[PDB]
Design an enzyme around this catalytic site. Structure first.
Site, PDB file in Angstrom:
ATOM      1  N   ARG A 101       1.040  -0.881   0.135  1.00  0.00           N
ATOM      2  CA  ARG A 101       0.131  -0.170  -0.105  1.00  0.00           C
ATOM      3  C   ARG A 101       0.792   1.255  -0.125  1.00  0.00           C
ATOM      4  O   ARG A 101       1.954   1.461   0.954  1.00  0.00           O
ATOM      5  CB  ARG A 101      -0.700  -0.256   1.322  1.00  0.00           C
ATOM      6  CG  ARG A 101      -1.846   1.171   1.407  1.00  0.00           C
ATOM      7  CD  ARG A 101      -2.150   1.150   1.647  1.00  0.00           C
ATOM      8  NE  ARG A 101      -4.256  -0.067   1.961  1.00  0.00           N
ATOM      9  CZ  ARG A 101      -4.947   0.722   1.471  1.00  0.00           C
ATOM     10  NH1 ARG A 101      -5.560   2.010   1.791  1.00  0.00           N
ATOM     11  NH2 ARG A 101      -6.126  -0.067   1.230  1.00  0.00           N
ATOM     12  N   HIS A 128      -6.412   0.513  -7.882  1.00  0.00           N
ATOM     13  CA  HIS A 128      -6.971  -0.039  -6.458  1.00  0.00           C
ATOM     14  C   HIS A 128      -7.822  -1.586  -7.519  1.00  0.00           C
ATOM     15  O   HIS A 128      -8.333  -1.611  -7.454  1.00  0.00           O
ATOM     16  CB  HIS A 128      -8.126   0.502  -6.188  1.00  0.00           C
ATOM     17  CG  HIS A 128      -8.425  -0.629  -5.014  1.00  0.00           C
ATOM     18  ND1 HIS A 128      -8.662   0.329  -3.233  1.00  0.00           N
ATOM     19  CD2 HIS A 128      -7.895  -1.257  -3.780  1.00  0.00           C
ATOM     20  CE1 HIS A 128      -9.204  -0.408  -2.698  1.00  0.00           C
ATOM     21  NE2 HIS A 128      -8.023  -1.193  -2.772  1.00  0.00           N
ATOM     22  N   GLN A 131      -9.938  -3.456  -5.038  1.00  0.00           N
ATOM     23  CA  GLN A 131     -11.476  -3.425  -5.472  1.00  0.00           C
ATOM     24  C   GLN A 131     -12.155  -3.589  -6.040  1.00  0.00           C
ATOM     25  O   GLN A 131     -13.613  -3.830  -6.319  1.00  0.00           O
ATOM     26  CB  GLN A 131     -11.006  -1.579  -5.014  1.00  0.00           C
ATOM     27  CG  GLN A 131     -12.433  -1.039  -4.627  1.00  0.00           C
ATOM     28  CD  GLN A 131     -13.004  -1.916  -3.117  1.00  0.00           C
ATOM     29  OE1 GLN A 131     -12.634  -1.861  -2.622  1.00  0.00           O
ATOM     30  NE2 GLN A 131     -14.214  -2.622  -3.460  1.00  0.00           N
ATOM     31  N   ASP A 214     -18.312   6.839  -4.090  1.00  0.00           N
ATOM     32  CA  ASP A 214     -16.302   6.805  -2.632  1.00  0.00           C
ATOM     33  C   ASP A 214     -15.995   8.472  -1.655  1.00  0.00           C
ATOM     34  O   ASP A 214     -16.537   8.768  -3.253  1.00  0.00           O
ATOM     35  CB  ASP A 214     -15.304   6.140  -3.177  1.00  0.00           C
ATOM     36  CG  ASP A 214     -14.263   5.922  -2.165  1.00  0.00           C
ATOM     37  OD1 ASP A 214     -14.265   5.435  -1.375  1.00  0.00           O
ATOM     38  OD2 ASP A 214     -13.729   6.502  -3.219  1.00  0.00           O
ATOM     39  N   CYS A 246     -16.549   1.860  -2.015  1.00  0.00           N
ATOM     40  CA  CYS A 246     -15.618   1.687  -0.863  1.00  0.00           C
ATOM     41  C   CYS A 246     -15.786   1.294   0.128  1.00  0.00           C
ATOM     42  O   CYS A 246     -14.983   0.104   0.829  1.00  0.00           O
ATOM     43  CB  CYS A 246     -14.920   2.550  -1.680  1.00  0.00           C
ATOM     44  SG  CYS A 246     -14.402   1.806  -3.237  1.00  0.00           S
ATOM     45  N   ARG A 274     -14.432  -8.463  -1.307  1.00  0.00           N
ATOM     46  CA  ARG A 274     -12.313  -8.708  -1.641  1.00  0.00           C
ATOM     47  C   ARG A 274     -11.852  -9.069  -0.682  1.00  0.00           C
ATOM     48  O   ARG A 274     -10.719  -9.682  -1.066  1.00  0.00           O
ATOM     49  CB  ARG A 274     -12.139  -7.094  -0.733  1.00  0.00           C
ATOM     50  CG  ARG A 274     -12.747  -5.491  -0.967  1.00  0.00           C
ATOM     51  CD  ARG A 274     -13.158  -4.703  -0.325  1.00  0.00           C
ATOM     52  NE  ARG A 274     -13.894  -4.329   1.260  1.00  0.00           N
ATOM     53  CZ  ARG A 274     -13.034  -4.052   2.042  1.00  0.00           C
ATOM     54  NH1 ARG A 274     -11.827  -4.121   2.270  1.00  0.00           N
ATOM     55  NH2 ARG A 274     -14.554  -4.075   2.867  1.00  0.00           N
TER      56      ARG A 274
END
Ligand SMILES: [Mg+2]
Ligand code: NA
Length: 287
Positions: A101, A128, A131, A214, A246, A274
Protein backbone atom coordinates in the site's frame (compact mmCIF):
# COMPACT_ATOMS: atom_id res chain seq x y z
CA UNK A 1 -3.66 -13.89 -15.92
CA UNK A 2 0.01 -14.29 -16.47
CA UNK A 3 1.87 -11.20 -15.29
CA UNK A 4 4.04 -11.89 -12.24
CA UNK A 5 2.44 -8.96 -10.45
CA UNK A 6 -0.95 -7.30 -10.03
CA UNK A 7 -0.36 -3.54 -9.94
CA UNK A 8 -3.29 -2.91 -12.30
CA UNK A 9 -4.85 -4.78 -15.22
CA UNK A 10 -2.19 -3.83 -17.80
CA UNK A 11 -1.36 -7.35 -18.94
CA UNK A 12 -4.82 -8.83 -18.55
CA UNK A 13 -7.17 -9.86 -21.32
CA UNK A 14 -10.87 -10.79 -20.87
CA UNK A 15 -10.15 -14.50 -20.39
CA UNK A 16 -7.65 -13.86 -17.61
CA UNK A 17 -9.95 -11.46 -15.74
CA UNK A 18 -12.79 -13.96 -16.03
CA UNK A 19 -10.60 -16.77 -14.65
CA UNK A 20 -9.82 -14.71 -11.55
CA UNK A 21 -13.49 -13.84 -11.14
CA UNK A 22 -14.56 -17.45 -11.69
CA UNK A 23 -12.07 -18.59 -9.05
CA UNK A 24 -13.25 -15.96 -6.55
CA UNK A 25 -16.84 -17.07 -7.09
CA UNK A 26 -15.89 -20.71 -6.59
CA UNK A 27 -13.89 -19.93 -3.44
CA UNK A 28 -16.90 -18.05 -2.05
CA UNK A 29 -19.40 -20.80 -2.87
CA UNK A 30 -17.13 -23.36 -1.24
CA UNK A 31 -16.44 -21.14 1.81
CA UNK A 32 -12.97 -22.41 0.95
CA UNK A 33 -10.42 -23.23 3.62
CA UNK A 34 -7.26 -25.06 2.57
CA UNK A 35 -3.50 -25.50 2.73
CA UNK A 36 -2.59 -24.40 -0.80
CA UNK A 37 -0.26 -21.77 0.64
CA UNK A 38 1.05 -23.71 3.64
CA UNK A 39 4.60 -22.66 4.41
CA UNK A 40 4.20 -19.48 2.36
CA UNK A 41 4.26 -15.92 3.68
CA UNK A 42 2.87 -12.67 2.29
CA UNK A 43 4.61 -9.48 3.42
CA UNK A 44 2.26 -6.56 4.01
CA UNK A 45 4.37 -3.51 3.13
CA UNK A 46 2.14 -0.59 4.09
CA UNK A 47 3.55 2.95 3.84
CA UNK A 48 0.35 4.09 5.53
CA UNK A 49 -1.68 1.94 7.93
CA UNK A 50 -4.94 0.49 6.61
CA UNK A 51 -6.89 -1.62 9.06
CA UNK A 52 -9.34 -2.74 6.37
CA UNK A 53 -6.67 -3.99 3.96
CA UNK A 54 -4.60 -5.59 6.70
CA UNK A 55 -7.64 -7.55 7.87
CA UNK A 56 -8.52 -8.71 4.35
CA UNK A 57 -5.05 -9.96 3.46
CA UNK A 58 -4.26 -11.55 6.82
CA UNK A 59 -7.57 -13.42 6.73
CA UNK A 60 -7.05 -14.37 3.08
CA UNK A 61 -3.64 -15.93 3.76
CA UNK A 62 -4.87 -17.77 6.83
CA UNK A 63 -7.74 -19.25 4.84
CA UNK A 64 -5.25 -20.59 2.33
CA UNK A 65 -3.07 -22.09 5.04
CA UNK A 66 -0.34 -19.46 4.88
CA UNK A 67 0.44 -16.22 6.71
CA UNK A 68 0.84 -12.52 6.27
CA UNK A 69 3.51 -10.60 8.19
CA UNK A 70 2.88 -6.90 8.86
CA UNK A 71 5.66 -4.43 8.02
CA UNK A 72 4.80 -0.95 9.31
CA UNK A 73 7.09 1.03 7.00
CA UNK A 74 5.75 4.28 8.43
CA UNK A 75 8.13 3.50 11.27
CA UNK A 76 11.11 4.23 9.00
CA UNK A 77 11.62 7.92 8.29
CA UNK A 78 12.97 9.47 5.11
CA UNK A 79 16.23 10.03 6.97
CA UNK A 80 16.59 6.25 7.34
CA UNK A 81 14.86 5.10 4.14
CA UNK A 82 16.48 2.35 2.06
CA UNK A 83 16.48 2.43 -1.75
CA UNK A 84 13.50 0.45 -3.08
CA UNK A 85 15.85 -2.11 -4.68
CA UNK A 86 17.36 -2.92 -1.26
CA UNK A 87 13.91 -3.38 0.23
CA UNK A 88 12.96 -5.70 -2.63
CA UNK A 89 16.21 -7.69 -2.66
CA UNK A 90 15.95 -8.27 1.08
CA UNK A 91 12.25 -9.25 1.26
CA UNK A 92 12.40 -11.63 -1.70
CA UNK A 93 14.67 -13.85 0.46
CA UNK A 94 12.08 -14.14 3.25
CA UNK A 95 8.61 -14.13 1.71
CA UNK A 96 6.77 -15.63 -1.28
CA UNK A 97 4.89 -12.43 -2.10
CA UNK A 98 4.61 -8.73 -1.24
CA UNK A 99 1.33 -6.82 -0.85
CA UNK A 100 2.05 -3.08 -0.79
CA UNK A 101 0.00 0.00 0.00
CA UNK A 102 1.88 3.06 -1.21
CA UNK A 103 1.47 6.82 -1.50
CA UNK A 104 2.81 6.79 -5.06
CA UNK A 105 2.18 4.10 -7.67
CA UNK A 106 5.75 4.61 -8.89
CA UNK A 107 6.88 2.96 -5.66
CA UNK A 108 4.95 -0.30 -6.09
CA UNK A 109 6.00 -0.41 -9.75
CA UNK A 110 9.63 -0.13 -8.62
CA UNK A 111 9.10 -2.81 -5.97
CA UNK A 112 7.70 -5.20 -8.59
CA UNK A 113 10.55 -4.39 -10.99
CA UNK A 114 13.20 -5.23 -8.38
CA UNK A 115 11.61 -8.23 -6.63
CA UNK A 116 11.66 -11.76 -8.04
CA UNK A 117 8.50 -12.67 -6.09
CA UNK A 118 4.95 -11.53 -6.97
CA UNK A 119 3.99 -8.01 -5.96
CA UNK A 120 0.37 -7.00 -5.43
CA UNK A 121 -0.68 -3.36 -5.30
CA UNK A 122 -3.00 -3.34 -2.28
CA UNK A 123 -3.64 0.32 -3.09
CA UNK A 124 -1.89 3.25 -4.74
CA UNK A 125 -2.79 6.77 -5.81
CA UNK A 126 -3.23 5.51 -9.38
CA UNK A 127 -4.99 2.18 -9.04
CA UNK A 128 -6.83 -0.27 -6.83
CA UNK A 129 -7.12 -3.59 -8.74
CA UNK A 130 -8.24 -5.54 -5.68
CA UNK A 131 -11.23 -3.25 -5.14
CA UNK A 132 -12.27 -3.50 -8.80
CA UNK A 133 -12.26 -7.31 -8.63
CA UNK A 134 -14.51 -7.22 -5.58
CA UNK A 135 -16.81 -4.78 -7.39
CA UNK A 136 -17.09 -7.05 -10.45
CA UNK A 137 -17.82 -10.18 -8.41
CA UNK A 138 -20.55 -8.20 -6.64
CA UNK A 139 -22.09 -7.02 -9.91
CA UNK A 140 -21.82 -10.54 -11.32
CA UNK A 141 -23.60 -12.02 -8.28
CA UNK A 142 -26.36 -9.45 -8.40
CA UNK A 143 -27.10 -9.48 -12.12
CA UNK A 144 -25.85 -12.89 -13.28
CA UNK A 145 -23.50 -11.44 -15.87
CA UNK A 146 -21.27 -8.41 -16.45
CA UNK A 147 -21.56 -7.82 -20.20
CA UNK A 148 -23.89 -4.91 -20.86
CA UNK A 149 -24.18 -3.76 -17.25
CA UNK A 150 -24.49 -0.01 -16.92
CA UNK A 151 -22.48 1.25 -13.97
CA UNK A 152 -22.58 4.88 -12.96
CA UNK A 153 -19.71 6.37 -10.98
CA UNK A 154 -20.55 9.63 -9.26
CA UNK A 155 -17.71 11.32 -7.46
CA UNK A 156 -13.97 11.87 -7.62
CA UNK A 157 -11.89 10.56 -10.51
CA UNK A 158 -9.66 8.46 -8.26
CA UNK A 159 -7.76 5.17 -8.10
CA UNK A 160 -10.95 3.14 -7.69
CA UNK A 161 -12.56 4.71 -10.77
CA UNK A 162 -9.31 4.19 -12.70
CA UNK A 163 -9.38 0.44 -12.12
CA UNK A 164 -13.11 0.23 -12.79
CA UNK A 165 -12.51 1.98 -16.12
CA UNK A 166 -9.60 -0.35 -16.91
CA UNK A 167 -11.61 -3.54 -16.31
CA UNK A 168 -14.67 -2.04 -18.01
CA UNK A 169 -13.74 -3.03 -21.58
CA UNK A 170 -12.42 -6.41 -20.40
CA UNK A 171 -15.81 -7.30 -18.91
CA UNK A 172 -18.21 -5.50 -21.25
CA UNK A 173 -19.30 -2.89 -18.72
CA UNK A 174 -21.01 0.30 -19.87
CA UNK A 175 -19.56 2.92 -17.54
CA UNK A 176 -20.98 6.40 -17.02
CA UNK A 177 -18.82 8.88 -15.12
CA UNK A 178 -19.78 12.07 -13.31
CA UNK A 179 -17.13 14.15 -11.54
CA UNK A 180 -16.82 17.88 -10.80
CA UNK A 181 -14.80 19.97 -13.24
CA UNK A 182 -11.08 19.41 -12.75
CA UNK A 183 -11.55 16.09 -10.91
CA UNK A 184 -11.94 13.97 -14.04
CA UNK A 185 -10.07 10.74 -14.82
CA UNK A 186 -7.48 10.54 -17.62
CA UNK A 187 -9.09 10.87 -21.08
CA UNK A 188 -7.38 7.69 -22.23
CA UNK A 189 -8.93 5.42 -19.61
CA UNK A 190 -12.33 6.87 -20.49
CA UNK A 191 -12.00 6.49 -24.25
CA UNK A 192 -10.62 2.97 -23.95
CA UNK A 193 -13.70 2.06 -21.90
CA UNK A 194 -15.84 4.06 -24.33
CA UNK A 195 -17.32 5.55 -21.18
CA UNK A 196 -19.99 8.22 -21.00
CA UNK A 197 -18.77 11.32 -19.17
CA UNK A 198 -20.74 14.25 -17.82
CA UNK A 199 -20.58 16.78 -15.00
CA UNK A 200 -24.22 16.07 -14.06
CA UNK A 201 -24.75 13.18 -11.58
CA UNK A 202 -28.39 12.81 -12.63
CA UNK A 203 -27.36 12.18 -16.25
CA UNK A 204 -24.81 9.54 -15.31
CA UNK A 205 -27.15 7.70 -12.94
CA UNK A 206 -30.38 7.70 -14.97
CA UNK A 207 -31.51 4.15 -15.69
CA UNK A 208 -28.24 2.59 -14.52
CA UNK A 209 -27.91 -0.91 -13.06
CA UNK A 210 -25.74 0.55 -10.33
CA UNK A 211 -24.58 3.76 -8.73
CA UNK A 212 -21.08 3.70 -7.27
CA UNK A 213 -19.39 6.33 -5.13
CA UNK A 214 -16.58 6.63 -2.61
CA UNK A 215 -14.88 9.30 -0.52
CA UNK A 216 -13.92 12.57 -2.11
CA UNK A 217 -10.45 13.94 -2.39
CA UNK A 218 -14.19 23.46 2.21
CA UNK A 219 -13.01 24.06 -1.35
CA UNK A 220 -13.25 20.36 -2.17
CA UNK A 221 -16.62 19.87 -0.49
CA UNK A 222 -17.94 22.95 -2.28
CA UNK A 223 -16.86 21.57 -5.68
CA UNK A 224 -18.74 18.33 -5.00
CA UNK A 225 -22.04 20.07 -4.21
CA UNK A 226 -24.77 17.86 -5.62
CA UNK A 227 -22.69 14.69 -6.02
CA UNK A 228 -23.95 13.05 -2.83
CA UNK A 229 -25.49 9.64 -3.53
CA UNK A 230 -28.57 9.77 -1.31
CA UNK A 231 -31.96 8.08 -1.34
CA UNK A 232 -33.15 10.61 -3.91
CA UNK A 233 -30.34 10.04 -6.41
CA UNK A 234 -30.72 6.27 -6.05
CA UNK A 235 -34.28 6.73 -7.34
CA UNK A 236 -32.83 7.54 -10.78
CA UNK A 237 -31.53 3.99 -11.27
CA UNK A 238 -33.59 1.31 -12.97
CA UNK A 239 -35.84 -0.68 -10.56
CA UNK A 240 -33.31 -3.48 -10.01
CA UNK A 241 -30.37 -1.08 -9.63
CA UNK A 242 -28.02 -1.28 -6.65
CA UNK A 243 -25.69 0.96 -4.63
CA UNK A 244 -21.95 0.38 -4.19
CA UNK A 245 -19.45 2.26 -2.02
CA UNK A 246 -15.84 1.38 -1.14
CA UNK A 247 -16.12 2.49 2.48
CA UNK A 248 -15.64 3.90 4.87
CA UNK A 249 -18.34 6.48 4.20
CA UNK A 250 -18.16 10.18 5.01
CA UNK A 251 -21.84 10.46 5.88
CA UNK A 252 -23.23 13.86 4.98
CA UNK A 253 -20.72 14.02 2.14
CA UNK A 254 -20.68 11.51 -0.74
CA UNK A 255 -23.51 9.42 0.73
CA UNK A 256 -25.84 8.83 3.69
CA UNK A 257 -26.55 6.02 6.17
CA UNK A 258 -29.93 5.48 4.52
CA UNK A 259 -28.25 4.75 1.21
CA UNK A 260 -25.49 2.51 2.61
CA UNK A 261 -27.86 0.41 4.72
CA UNK A 262 -30.91 0.74 2.47
CA UNK A 263 -32.60 -1.90 0.24
CA UNK A 264 -30.55 -0.94 -2.85
CA UNK A 265 -27.25 -1.30 -1.02
CA UNK A 266 -24.81 -4.13 -1.74
CA UNK A 267 -22.02 -2.32 0.10
CA UNK A 268 -21.36 -5.08 2.61
CA UNK A 269 -21.45 -7.91 0.07
CA UNK A 270 -19.01 -5.71 -1.87
CA UNK A 271 -16.86 -5.51 1.25
CA UNK A 272 -16.99 -9.27 1.82
CA UNK A 273 -16.07 -9.82 -1.83
CA UNK A 274 -12.71 -8.18 -1.21
CA UNK A 275 -11.86 -11.29 0.82
CA UNK A 276 -12.90 -13.78 -1.85
CA UNK A 277 -11.12 -11.92 -4.64
CA UNK A 278 -7.97 -11.45 -2.53
CA UNK A 279 -7.94 -15.20 -1.93
CA UNK A 280 -8.32 -15.75 -5.69
CA UNK A 281 -5.44 -13.38 -6.48
CA UNK A 282 -3.11 -14.72 -3.78
CA UNK A 283 -3.73 -18.34 -4.69
CA UNK A 284 -3.13 -17.52 -8.37
CA UNK A 285 0.11 -15.57 -7.91
CA UNK A 286 1.62 -17.48 -4.96
CA UNK A 287 0.80 -21.16 -5.45
MG1 LIG B 1 1.25 -5.19 14.95
NA1 NA C 1 -0.85 -19.97 11.68
Amino acid sequence: TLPKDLLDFSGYGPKELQALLDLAEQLKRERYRGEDLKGKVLALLFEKPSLRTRTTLEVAMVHLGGHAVYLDQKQVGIGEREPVRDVAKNLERFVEGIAARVFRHETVEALARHAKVPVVNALSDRAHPLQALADLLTLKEVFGGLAGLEVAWVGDGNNVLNSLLEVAPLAGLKVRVATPKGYEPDPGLLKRANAFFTHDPKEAALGAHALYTDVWTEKRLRDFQGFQVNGELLKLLRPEGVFLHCLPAHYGEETTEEAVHGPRSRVFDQAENRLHTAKAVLLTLLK
